[PDB]
Design a protein around this nucleic acid. Structure first.
Ligand code: K
Ligand code: K
Ligand code: MG
Ligand code: MG
Ligand code: MG
Ligand code: MG
Ligand code: MG
Ligand code: MG
Ligand code: MG
Ligand code: MG
Ligand code: MG
Ligand code: MG
Ligand code: MG
Ligand code: MG
Ligand code: MG
Ligand code: MG
Ligand code: MG
Ligand code: MG
Ligand code: MG
Ligand code: MG
Ligand code: MG
Ligand code: MG
Ligand code: MG
Ligand code: MG
Ligand code: MG
Ligand code: MG
Ligand code: MG
Lengths: 153, 50, 63, 107
RNA sequence: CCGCCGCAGGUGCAGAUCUUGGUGGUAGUAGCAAAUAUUCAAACGAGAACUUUGAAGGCCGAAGUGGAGAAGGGUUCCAU
RNA sequence: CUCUGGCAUGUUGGAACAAUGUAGGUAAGGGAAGUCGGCAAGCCGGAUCCGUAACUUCGGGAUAAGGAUUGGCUCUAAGG
């Protein structure tokens, strides 16, 4: 297991990763960038509000055709969405990172997400049928997610 | 069809008996490279042609 | 649970359609562990499964 | 006063004004459900089967204009659920809707 | 595995609507709009717009969205 | 339209009701002035009783054209 970045103080850090997660990479990357540098309690509350469509994930890089919302004015952006599945996958991973911090005996309500990385994973093959007897790719874009949480005063 | 000759029925018998997964203990044998039956026929995908 | 087998079996035993079979919505656990026609018959005798009446199509207007 | 019961007239006609024919009865159920949340101040609103039957009594598009309901807030302590209080909406058949006003129901 | 002296060649790619394999921008876009229609409650379950049960409202409307066959399929049948 | 029997709206759901569409409909007064062209739409429409032209291979044309009537209720007469 090599995270892209080694933690500064390994004894004050917890890590969690997941591979080949059937969640949209583009949606998850935008979501992870939103919770980067957040406290774990703030991130947990924020992601649940995304699932409830009370706070939006601003789509800054993969925004082609993404609609505008009023909740994006809180990120200094005009385009936002509420990707539910990406938030649940990140929420599931945050809890696992939280359990890892407890297993290492770390102050849970001091952890901050310092590093979070979403990588495209191998695609999975599905087919769609087009006009004139043509078959086109219908591909899934999973992702590999990793994060490292560190205590902050 | 419900109407079938003995030769066609016996032919369909062999095709059903062959369409089974590999025994799990095949994999444990030395010099094994067969990780899954690559000759599995699904009735709706590929037809026998008879 | 899932009562497709019991709904199918009851319709065969009661000789009616599946739309006229009534499985008790309260005692579904006893209906669920009935996987034979013998047990379906007993549930019919016990009153758990009943045959609903035909929908009324009156000819009084025609008469 | 966590547990309280009140009777209310909901003007379904104003709530479902402009809705399409195939959506008028289902929207009436949604408008009742969100009427309960605003009044009783709790999510997890349960609509009695008889109130559903009453809204659907005249088909999917000719929903009754007014309906008399009984909102009874009760404790959801029977289950380990995130909501402690839930509202059960029940049907109150009436002959007329004139001079009928929101009223409290005593246990 | 290489230097030097000779020997030998299927010996040097940017192109050929080149060949094969892989990968992007398009793009989280087009789209998931033919045939009227779903709703309430409960169950099971980690999880329910979609499963099951009950209730309601609908449709097929006997030239059927019903009940059985031929050809063809070949186990798709049934239970877990 | 309904009963028996079957089904869950035809590979998704939620919210909204902008333009432009696809499908349907209505429109004062005029009435083909539109357009290559009445294209499209519209008019007509069942039945009963009247009334039906040119032409004709005497068979047709013919539901020509044109006109009236049509519900409900209570009776009367006739037809075994
Ligand atoms: K056949
Ligand atoms: K003209
Ligand atoms: Mg857009
Ligand atoms: Mg928006
Ligand atoms: Mg296609
Ligand atoms: Mg084809
Ligand atoms: Mg085929
Ligand atoms: Mg060579
Ligand atoms: Mg060469
Ligand atoms: Mg090249
Ligand atoms: Mg060149
Ligand atoms: Mg789109
Ligand atoms: Mg679409
Ligand atoms: Mg029809
Ligand atoms: Mg019908
Ligand atoms: Mg017909
Ligand atoms: Mg539809
Ligand atoms: Mg559906
Ligand atoms: Mg289909
Ligand atoms: Mg009008
Ligand atoms: Mg006009
Ligand atoms: Mg006029
Ligand atoms: Mg005129
Ligand atoms: Mg002109
Ligand atoms: Mg002109
Ligand atoms: Mg025409
Ligand atoms: Mg003529």
């Amino acid at each position: 297991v090599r995270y892209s970045l080694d933690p500064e103080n390994p004894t004050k850090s917890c890590k969690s990763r997941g591979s080949n997660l059937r969640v949209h990479f583009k949606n998850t990357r935008e979501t992870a960038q939103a919770i980067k540098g957040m406290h774990i309690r703030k991130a947990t509350k924020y992601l649940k509000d995304v699932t409830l469509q009370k706070q939006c994930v601003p789509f800054r890089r993969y925004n082609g055709g993404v609609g505008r919302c009023a909740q994006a004015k809180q990120w200094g952006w005009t385009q936002g969405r509420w990707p539910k599945k990406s938030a649940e996958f990140l929420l599931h991973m945050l809890k696992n990172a939280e359990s890892n911090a407890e297993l290492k005996g770390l102050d849970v309500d001091s952890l901050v997400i310092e590093h979070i990385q979403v990588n495209k994973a191998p695609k999975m093959r599905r087919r769609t049928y087009r006009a004139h007897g043509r078959i086109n790719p219908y591909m899934s874009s999973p992702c590999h997610i990793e994060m490292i949480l560190t205590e902050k005063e | 069809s419900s109407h079938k000759t003995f030769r066609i029925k016996r032919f369909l018998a062999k095709k059903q008996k062959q369409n089974r997964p590999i025994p799990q203990w095949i994999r444990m044998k030395t010099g094994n490279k067969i990780r899954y039956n690559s000759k599995r026929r699904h009735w709706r995908r590929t037809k026998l042609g008879l | 649970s899932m009562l497709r087998l019991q709904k199918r079996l009851a319709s065969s035993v009661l000789r009616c359609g599946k739309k006229k079979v009534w499985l008790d919505p309260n005692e579904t656990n006893e209906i669920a562990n009935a996987n034979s026609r013998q047990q379906i018959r007993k549930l019919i005798k016990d009153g758990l499964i009943i045959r609903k009446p035909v929908t009324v199509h009156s000819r009084a207007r025609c008469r | 006063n966590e547990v309280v019961t009140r009777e209310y007239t909901i003007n379904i006609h104003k709530r479902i004004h402009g809705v399409g024919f195939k959506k008028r009865a289902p929207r009436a159920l949604k408008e009742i459900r969100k009427f309960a949340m605003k009044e009783m101040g709790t999510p997890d609103v349960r609509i009695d089967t008889r109130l559903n039957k009453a809204v659907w009594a005249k088909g999917i598009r000719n929903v009754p204009y007014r309906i008399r309901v009984r909102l009874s807030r009760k404790r959801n302590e029977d289950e380990d659920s995130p909501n402690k209080l839930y509202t059960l909406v029940t049907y109150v058949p009436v002959t007329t809707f004139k001079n009928l006003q929101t009223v409290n129901v005593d246990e």
